[PDB]
Design a protein around this ligand. Structure first.
Ligand SMILES: COc1ccc(CN2[C@@H]3C[C@H]2CN(c2ccc(-c4cc(OCC(C)(C)O)cn5ncc(C#N)c45)cn2)C3)cn1
Ligand SMILES: COc1ccc(CN2[C@@H]3C[C@H]2CN(c2ccc(-c4cc(OCC(C)(C)O)cn5ncc(C#N)c45)cn2)C3)cn1
Lengths: 279, 286
C-alpha cells in the first residue's frame, strides 16, 4: 500500500546520517507508541565534534498510522526552514529502527515550561506576548508554504535555548477519522472534517489561552463529547485571571464560527507587536 | 437506549485498572444494576480530557458492538452513562486482568508453568486458546472482524474464564465479507495479517492470522512477538516468507496450527471452527 511504498522508498543522501556517529542517551519523553531520546551526533551537517540532538523513534508495538506519522513528519521537515520551526538534521534508515534526528530544545515542551514557571521561574506579560508572537511568526511562514499544522498546541511547541519557541510534531500536518484532541479542533473540523489555515487559527487561540493561564487545561471540567453542542450554540472559554481585554479579544476572534471572520497569522503577529511596543 | 442506559448516581468510580494517552479503565461499583440487589463490582471504560474524534468514535463503536453480541467468552456489557456527563461504558470486572499480564505473572508468581489458579499446565494453555477460538467463531458468524486480537485484549475472569475485549477497532463485514480502510490502520504491525498490512483488507481470515500470534503469546507465556525486530522491517520479512520460529514450550502439532494461521493466501488458512477442532483433538490426546 501507500506505507509499504514509503517504507521501501525511505529504506532505499543529503538527509541520511551514519548510525555509527549517533550515540543515544536518556529518554526525553515516551508513550506506548513511540519515544524521544537525547543523543549526540558526530559530524552532523558539517559541524565540528559532537552536536546535541533529539532522536524520534517508534516502539515495538507501533501501528501503521504511527509509522506513517513519522515518515510524514520527515517529509514535511525537509521542505521547511524557519528560526521558530523545529530543525530536522536528518535520519538513520540503513541500520536498525528508523530514527529522525531533530534539534535539542533544553527547556522541553511549552506546556511543561509554563507549568514549572510561576506568576508575574520569572515570566512577565511581555515574555508571554513574546512566546505567542514567535509561534505566530512560525505559523505565518507555514501558512505561506501551504501547510496546515493541524495539531497546534502547547505540548507541541518546544522551548529552545534563549527561550526561543519551536513549532514541532508535524506527524498530522497536511499540504494544500481525525486524531487531533477535540478541545483544540475548530468547529468546521469537528462537524465538516475541514482543515485549513483558519482552523490552525482556532487552535492558536487555544494555545494563546494555555500561554496566558501558564499551561492550563482548556475547557476545564467539560468532557470533549459535550463540546460539539457548546461550540455550536456559541459558548466559548471565559476571560482567565491575569489576562487583558485586548488579549481576550484576540482569542474570541480566533474562535469565530465563520473561518473568514477569523484573523490570519499576519494579523495576529501585528496585534502582538502592538501589545509589546505600547508596554 | 432504555435497555442499556444506567443512572449516573448509582455508579461509584474507584482506582485506575489501566490507562493510555487516549483513554482509561477504572474499577467501580454499580447500585441496582440490571435487577440485581445492591452493589455489583464492575469496570468502567472512559476517555481522557485530550480525546480525539476517532477515540470518541471507537468508544461508541465498542458500545454498539457489545449491545449486539452475547457469548460466555466475550466481555459482558452491563450498560452505559451517556446523558449529561462524560461517556462511561460499564463492563464486567475480570479479577486476573489481561491474559498478557496473567501469563507474565506466572513466570515470577508460583507454582507457575509446570509443563492452583496460578499453577499452569500445557492443557490449561490449550484450554485458554480454545475458549478464544470459540468466541472468535461466534463473532465470525455475526459478520464482525475484531481486528486487534491479542493477549493484552483477552481478559481473564473468575475460574480462569477467557473474555475477548477491546472492541474499539472492531468492524462490521456483512456485505462483501471484508472491511477495507483507505487510510492507515491503528492495530500494531506485529499482530496484523499480510493482506491487512499491504492491501488494507480486514476479513475473518485476517483475525485467524492474529489468533496465530495470540497462540505464540500463550505458549511463550506473554512473550513479545518478532523479538528484537522493529515493525518497519516486518514489511520485507512477511513478504519474503519469514515467520516466527517455534518456541520452546510448543509441540509440532501446535506450531503447524500457527504456520497454517500465517499462510500468505487467506483462503489456505483454517477457519475458527477448524481451529477449535484442532485444540479439542490436542486436549484429549494429552
Ligand atoms: C510517530 O512517532 C512518534 C510520536 C510520538 C512520540 C513521543 N510522544 C510523547 C508525546 C509525543 C511527543 N513526546 C516528546 C518527547 C520529548 C520531547 C522533547 C523533550 C525535551 O525535553 C528537555 C527536558 C528533559 C525537559 O529538559 C527536549 N526535546 N528536544 C526535542 C524534542 C522533541 N521532539 C524534545 C518532545 N516531545 C512525548 C515519538 N514518536
Ligand atoms: C475508545 O476508548 C478507549 C479505548 C481503550 C481504553 C483503555 N486502553 C488501555 C489499553 C486499552 C485497554 N485498557 C485496559 C485497562 C484495564 C483493563 C482491565 C484490567 C483489569 O485488571 C485487574 C487487575 C489490575 C489485574 O487486578 C480488570 N478489568 N476488568 C475489565 C477491564 C476492562 N476493560 C479490566 C483492560 N484494559 C488500557 C479506554 N478507552
Amino acid at each position: 500500500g501507500p506505507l509499504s511504498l514509503s517504507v521501501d522508498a525511505f529504506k532505499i543522501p543529503k538527509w541520511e546520517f551514519p548510525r555509527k556517529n549517533l550515540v543515544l542517551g536518556k529518554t526525553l519523553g515516551e508513550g506506548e507508541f513511540g519515544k524521544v531520546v537525547k543523543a549526540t551526533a558526530f559530524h552532523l551537517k558539517g559541524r565540528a565534534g559532537y552536536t546535541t540532538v533529539a532522536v524520534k523513534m517508534l516502539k515495538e508495538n507501533a501501528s501503521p498510522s504511527e509509522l506513517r506519522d513519522l515518515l510524514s513528519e520527515f517529509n514535511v521537515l525537509k521542505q521547511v526552514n524557519h528560526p521558530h520551526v523545529i530543525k530536522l538534521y536528518g535520519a538513520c534508515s540503513q541500520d536498525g529502527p528508523l530514527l529522525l534526528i531533530v534539534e535539542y530544545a533544553k527547556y522541553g515542551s511549552l506546556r511543561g515550561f509554563l507549568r514549572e514557571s510561576r506568576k508575574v521561574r520569572a515570566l512577565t506579560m511581555g515574555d508571554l506576548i513574546s512566546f505567542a508572537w514567535q509561534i505566530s511568526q512560525g505559523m505565518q511562514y507555514l501558512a505561506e508554504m501551504k501547510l496546515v499544522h493541524r495539531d497546534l498546541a502547547a505540548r507541541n511547541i518546544l522551548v529552545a535555548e534563549g527561550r526561543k519557541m519551536k513549532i514541532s510534531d508535524f506527524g498530522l500536518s497536511r499540504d494544500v477519522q481525525g486524531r487531533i484532541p477535540v478541545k483544540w479542533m475548530a468547529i468546521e473540523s469537528l462537524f465538516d472534517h475541514i482543515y485549513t489555515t483558519q482552523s490552525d487559527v482556532w487552535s492558536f487561540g487555544v494555545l494563546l489561552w494555555e500561554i496566558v493561564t501558564l499551561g492550563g487545561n482548556p475547557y476545564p471540567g467539560i468532557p470533549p463529547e459535550r463540546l460539539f453542542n457548546l461550540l455550536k450554540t456559541g459558548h466559548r472559554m471565559e476571560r482567565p485571571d491575569n489576562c487583558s481585554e485586548e488579549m481576550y479579544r484576540l482569542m474570541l476572534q480566533c474562535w469565530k464560527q465563520e473561518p473568514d471572520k477569523r484573523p490570519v497569522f499576519a494579523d495576529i503577529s501585528k496585534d502582538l507587536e502592538k501589545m509589546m511596543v505600547k508596554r
